[PDB]
Amino acid sequence: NRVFVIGVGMTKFEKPGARDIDYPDMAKEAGQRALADAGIKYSAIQQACVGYVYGDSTCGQRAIYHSLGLSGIPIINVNNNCSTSTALFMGRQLIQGGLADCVLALGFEKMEPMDKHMEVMINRYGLAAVPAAPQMFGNAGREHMEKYGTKPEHFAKVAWKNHKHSTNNPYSQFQDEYSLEQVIDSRKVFEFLTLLQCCPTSDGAGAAVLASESFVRRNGLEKKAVEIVAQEMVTDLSTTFEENSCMKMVGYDMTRLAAERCYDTAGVKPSDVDVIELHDCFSANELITYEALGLCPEGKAGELIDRGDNTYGGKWVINPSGGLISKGHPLGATGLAQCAELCWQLRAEAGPRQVPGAKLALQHNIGLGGAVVVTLYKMGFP
């Protein structure tokens, strides 16, 4: 059962408190945008999958009813207690499993001794991270430098490149080009990681309408249908003391396996991917993720970076959106915003960010559990 994204929508991602609307209105703007993009009636939505981190179990229903009106459709909260997914992944499962023909994936967030120090830092500098995460990604980045000769400047260049892409994304909280020097000189967060290398919190919402093949054909929606040609989630891989590493502790092998299974399923390889949206919570994650995704061999991200093979004119255009580093990271909404950008890219509607001739898109995203989801997209009916 093939699955298509037939419409996408998001709010601008803004600094918490910069825009005075509550989460239901954020959700309504994203959802109504995705529904208008899809070109379907609201009644065509048979189920909704709703991702958000903060607030009680009723928020998903409240967002959906405010957006679509009252109905009796299933409203599934992605983040439960007993399983530890994403809205898009669950949406795709519903279509692929034959449990629905047309579904709305909706995501939103509105913000409501070293660990203690990181908590205070995260609060004061407005970072979208848990206290452990700067330290874990700093540990992973250091391990990479020590094992492969990567320089602290490489991590700063990754962040620099993201901020530069962001100048052409009106949905991004930050749209300013910083100099490389400014990235290096921004406030220290942990170790080599400075503030301009860490994702800030944004408030916002994202949405996608997903549909079966028969739905797309019956409604004549072939034109905007972006096919999910593969999608894989990998949860924690249990390893021994002797094989554990800082890189593995931040999900390197989960990304690697997820991507390998995608490539095999779609019959493609890393070099066929034209455009990437990945989970750059820290520059260190983006950098090691280049190797996890198999874009370059082990320890060679530094070279890829120095050649500009992660930006326009290089092999891969990575985070044309500006990444989490520029957009900011509303926990429930980030994945759907990556999906929006990749769909626009493949539809040739990405305007000043357009990757010319993009046909194969790759998404890399992390669920609330820490699970990694890698998704491959191509136009469904070219």
XYZ file of C-alpha atoms in Angstrom:
382
model
C 0.000 0.000 0.000
C 1.832 3.084 -1.283
C 1.615 6.305 0.787
C 1.518 9.937 -0.376
C 1.796 13.282 1.239
C -0.740 15.372 -0.694
C -0.570 18.582 1.254
C 1.667 20.357 3.762
C 1.491 23.437 5.933
C 3.211 25.108 8.844
C 3.203 28.243 10.848
C 6.256 30.435 11.031
C 8.460 29.113 13.825
C 8.968 32.019 16.265
C 10.620 32.835 19.529
C 8.391 31.760 22.419
C 6.115 34.680 23.306
C 6.877 36.703 20.140
C 3.442 35.815 18.732
C 0.490 35.976 21.082
C -1.713 33.024 20.052
C -2.338 29.757 21.889
C -1.509 26.267 20.523
C -5.011 25.608 19.117
C -4.727 28.628 16.849
C -1.185 27.569 15.845
C -2.496 24.136 15.029
C -5.426 25.578 13.084
C -3.141 27.725 10.907
C -0.838 24.791 10.045
C -3.647 22.279 9.595
C -5.900 24.536 7.508
C -2.887 25.388 5.378
C -2.128 21.694 4.748
C -5.776 20.981 3.988
C -5.987 23.876 1.496
C -2.713 22.659 -0.088
C -4.181 19.162 -0.373
C -7.390 20.472 -2.029
C -9.791 18.223 -0.109
C -12.778 18.766 2.148
C -12.284 18.575 5.900
C -14.611 15.581 5.981
C -12.138 13.537 3.895
C -9.848 13.284 7.002
C -10.655 9.891 8.565
C -8.082 9.972 11.390
C -5.681 12.449 12.933
C -2.292 11.750 14.494
C -1.140 14.542 16.769
C 2.367 15.058 18.141
C 3.105 17.366 21.058
C 5.315 17.039 24.132
C 4.026 19.549 26.715
C 0.515 19.580 28.243
C -2.178 16.977 29.106
C -3.793 14.249 26.982
C -6.709 16.485 25.828
C -4.580 19.052 23.969
C -4.544 16.999 20.726
C -8.328 16.756 20.609
C -8.709 20.420 21.534
C -6.329 21.399 18.643
C -8.189 19.157 16.170
C -11.689 20.327 17.053
C -10.593 24.003 16.949
C -9.042 23.323 13.493
C -11.632 21.107 11.771
C -14.755 21.484 13.928
C -16.293 18.817 16.092
C -16.200 15.276 14.768
C -16.076 11.670 15.929
C -12.875 10.732 14.041
C -10.050 8.968 15.901
C -7.550 11.453 17.347
C -4.389 9.616 18.176
C -1.784 11.167 20.497
C 1.639 10.191 19.113
C 3.431 10.531 22.483
C 1.875 7.927 24.836
C 3.405 6.507 28.053
C 3.952 2.779 27.273
C 5.739 2.746 23.844
C 8.162 5.658 23.408
C 6.813 7.514 17.343
C 6.195 10.579 15.150
C 2.988 11.991 13.712
C 4.160 11.388 10.168
C 5.324 7.872 10.890
C 2.011 6.979 12.536
C 0.086 8.634 9.701
C 2.009 6.571 7.180
C 1.382 3.393 9.182
C -2.353 4.064 9.078
C -2.379 4.441 5.288
C 0.070 1.573 4.633
C -1.738 -0.769 6.990
C -5.105 -0.144 5.236
C -6.655 1.361 8.409
C -7.423 4.666 6.617
C -7.442 6.190 3.172
C -6.780 9.811 4.211
C -5.240 11.172 7.418
C -4.022 14.410 9.031
C -0.652 14.426 10.753
C -0.485 17.440 13.077
C 2.369 18.596 15.326
C 2.701 21.642 17.606
C 4.430 23.114 20.540
C 3.991 26.197 22.657
C 6.463 26.586 25.580
C 4.549 26.770 28.866
C 26.391 19.867 38.940
C 27.007 20.086 35.204
C 23.367 18.959 34.768
C 22.104 21.741 36.974
C 24.365 24.233 35.125
C 23.041 23.004 31.746
C 19.443 23.315 32.951
C 20.019 26.941 33.911
C 21.808 27.507 30.602
C 19.004 25.928 28.597
C 16.491 28.168 30.395
C 18.481 31.441 30.044
C 19.685 31.019 26.479
C 16.337 29.482 25.290
C 17.709 26.168 23.996
C 15.503 23.321 22.847
C 17.377 20.581 24.667
C 17.276 18.439 27.784
C 20.121 19.001 30.292
C 22.063 15.901 29.281
C 22.022 16.635 25.538
C 24.684 19.330 25.168
C 27.083 17.111 27.125
C 26.217 13.938 25.154
C 26.616 15.726 21.797
C 29.734 17.493 22.990
C 31.136 14.063 24.070
C 30.229 12.622 20.650
C 31.857 15.487 18.762
C 35.057 15.221 20.831
C 35.250 11.484 20.239
C 34.990 12.170 16.495
C 37.799 14.759 16.626
C 40.003 12.459 18.696
C 39.444 9.420 16.482
C 39.424 11.103 13.039
C 41.116 14.513 13.236
C 37.948 16.587 12.730
C 38.512 20.185 13.845
C 36.296 22.297 16.116
C 35.955 24.671 13.084
C 34.166 21.891 11.153
C 31.331 21.885 13.664
C 31.143 25.695 13.450
C 31.073 25.527 9.625
C 28.080 23.170 9.763
C 26.218 25.705 11.884
C 27.391 28.563 9.670
C 26.030 26.852 6.580
C 22.630 26.324 8.265
C 22.335 29.982 9.274
C 23.295 30.955 5.704
C 20.489 28.746 4.205
C 18.092 30.339 6.687
C 18.264 33.707 4.934
C 15.919 32.333 2.319
C 13.393 30.612 4.732
C 10.584 32.981 5.888
C 9.279 30.190 8.190
C 12.554 30.211 10.217
C 12.863 32.020 13.572
C 16.351 33.163 12.530
C 17.033 34.294 8.958
C 20.452 35.993 9.412
C 23.814 35.089 8.010
C 26.458 35.103 10.710
C 30.133 35.034 9.872
C 32.063 31.845 10.712
C 33.948 33.921 13.282
C 30.630 35.013 14.885
C 29.569 31.313 15.179
C 32.919 30.503 16.823
C 32.732 33.524 19.188
C 29.079 33.047 20.286
C 28.517 32.104 23.949
C 30.000 28.782 25.009
C 27.370 26.163 25.728
C 29.467 23.075 26.363
C 32.973 22.443 25.174
C 33.388 23.436 21.457
C 29.592 23.932 21.155
C 28.599 27.572 21.122
C 25.109 29.068 21.127
C 24.888 29.490 17.325
C 25.601 25.759 17.003
C 22.614 24.722 19.241
C 18.960 24.765 18.310
C 16.811 27.413 20.064
C 13.196 26.806 21.124
C 10.571 27.979 18.694
C 6.795 27.845 19.104
C 4.824 26.680 16.107
C 2.921 23.981 14.267
C 3.240 21.752 11.246
C 0.857 19.542 9.332
C 0.622 17.027 6.501
C -2.229 15.299 4.752
C -1.446 11.692 3.909
C -3.366 9.510 1.484
C -3.541 6.121 -0.192
C -2.989 5.535 -3.925
C -6.704 4.939 -4.530
C -7.561 8.192 -2.714
C -5.106 10.110 -4.891
C -6.467 8.569 -8.122
C -10.163 8.916 -7.262
C -9.651 12.611 -6.386
C -7.250 13.409 -9.253
C -4.496 14.598 -6.899
C -1.454 13.133 -8.743
C 0.242 16.532 -9.304
C 1.194 17.405 -5.668
C 1.424 13.760 -4.413
C 4.823 13.182 -2.820
C 5.383 9.493 -2.299
C 6.994 8.070 0.802
C 9.109 5.462 -0.972
C 10.578 4.226 2.357
C 10.454 4.976 6.069
C 12.225 3.261 8.932
C 12.294 3.818 12.647
C 15.086 2.365 14.805
C 14.817 2.400 18.571
C 17.754 1.865 20.927
C 20.282 -0.814 19.829
C 21.459 -2.733 22.865
C 25.292 -3.126 22.803
C 28.166 -4.328 25.046
C 30.529 -2.341 27.184
C 33.410 -3.043 24.796
C 31.518 -1.806 21.714
C 29.786 1.264 23.274
C 30.887 4.792 22.278
C 29.779 8.446 22.700
C 28.667 8.453 19.067
C 26.549 5.343 19.601
C 25.067 6.853 22.777
C 23.618 9.707 20.669
C 22.038 7.282 18.127
C 24.651 7.099 15.349
C 23.957 3.398 14.625
C 20.171 3.905 14.857
C 20.471 6.497 12.087
C 22.859 4.248 10.136
C 20.532 1.196 10.253
C 17.410 3.260 9.546
C 18.981 4.767 6.449
C 20.447 1.440 5.187
C 17.010 -0.167 5.387
C 15.457 2.800 3.517
C 18.096 2.703 0.738
C 17.578 -1.025 0.257
C 13.759 -0.714 0.223
C 13.714 2.147 -2.298
C 16.581 0.603 -4.342
C 18.717 3.724 -4.108
C 21.955 4.834 -2.559
C 23.194 7.965 -0.709
C 24.527 9.499 -3.914
C 20.990 9.465 -5.458
C 19.714 11.733 -2.608
C 19.551 15.363 -3.805
C 18.229 17.225 -0.758
C 18.230 16.488 2.960
C 16.414 17.813 6.033
C 18.010 16.358 9.156
C 17.824 16.735 12.895
C 20.587 19.250 13.637
C 19.740 19.798 17.317
C 23.486 20.501 17.633
C 26.006 20.976 14.828
C 27.707 17.853 16.217
C 24.684 15.727 15.353
C 24.562 17.024 11.789
C 28.277 16.380 11.261
C 28.260 12.735 12.437
C 24.947 12.157 10.695
C 26.729 12.795 7.342
C 28.675 9.550 8.026
C 25.711 7.691 9.565
C 23.690 8.404 6.389
C 26.617 7.103 4.299
C 27.183 10.323 2.381
C 30.880 9.958 3.045
C 33.038 7.294 4.590
C 33.805 7.063 8.305
C 35.755 10.063 9.600
C 35.477 12.071 6.313
C 32.738 14.597 7.221
C 35.453 17.225 7.631
C 36.378 16.864 3.954
C 32.720 16.869 2.828
C 32.294 20.118 4.828
C 35.463 21.721 3.432
C 34.352 20.986 -0.135
C 30.935 22.572 0.505
C 29.289 19.248 -0.377
C 26.452 20.010 2.133
C 25.222 23.139 0.317
C 24.177 24.649 -3.040
C 26.712 23.807 -5.769
C 27.872 20.682 -3.868
C 26.733 17.034 -3.920
C 23.980 17.417 -1.264
C 21.931 20.405 -0.287
C 21.489 19.799 3.452
C 18.883 21.724 5.451
C 17.751 24.260 2.852
C 15.277 25.327 5.573
C 18.174 26.512 7.768
C 17.874 23.429 9.989
C 16.745 23.296 13.603
C 19.716 25.599 14.355
C 17.951 28.483 12.492
C 14.285 27.484 12.572
C 14.267 26.608 16.193
C 12.738 23.372 17.464
C 9.093 23.225 18.609
C 9.262 19.600 19.779
C 5.971 18.340 18.318
C 6.197 20.296 15.036
C 9.790 19.893 13.805
C 9.304 16.679 11.846
C 6.322 18.025 9.926
C 8.218 21.187 9.018
C 11.068 19.068 7.555
C 8.442 17.164 5.554
C 6.910 20.448 4.342
C 10.278 21.687 3.027
C 11.149 18.410 1.317
C 7.687 18.235 -0.350
C 8.092 21.832 -1.574
C 11.575 20.981 -2.868
C 10.365 17.975 -4.828
C 7.339 19.893 -6.121
C 9.724 22.664 -7.327
C 7.901 25.142 -5.108
C 10.803 26.008 -2.766
C 11.313 29.452 -4.391
C 14.613 31.055 -3.302
C 15.733 27.779 -1.571
C 15.015 25.526 -4.605
C 17.455 22.705 -5.203
C 17.342 22.577 -9.056
C 16.292 19.134 -10.347
C 15.717 17.594 -6.909
C 13.997 14.220 -7.285
C 15.017 12.160 -4.180
C 14.687 13.717 -0.702
C 15.804 12.323 2.642
C 14.444 13.180 6.088
C 16.160 12.372 9.359
C 14.152 13.045 12.524
C 14.125 11.965 16.183
C 10.882 11.060 18.087
C 10.253 11.930 21.795
C 11.520 8.431 22.699
C 14.943 9.092 21.109
C 13.880 6.821 18.205
C 15.336 7.784 14.833
C 13.089 7.997 11.757
C 14.596 8.182 8.268
C 12.207 8.825 5.385
C 12.787 8.868 1.615
C 10.527 10.862 -0.696
C 9.991 11.052 -4.492
C 7.154 12.518 -6.585
C 4.473 9.833 -6.805
C 3.480 10.393 -10.508
C 6.309 12.334 -12.215
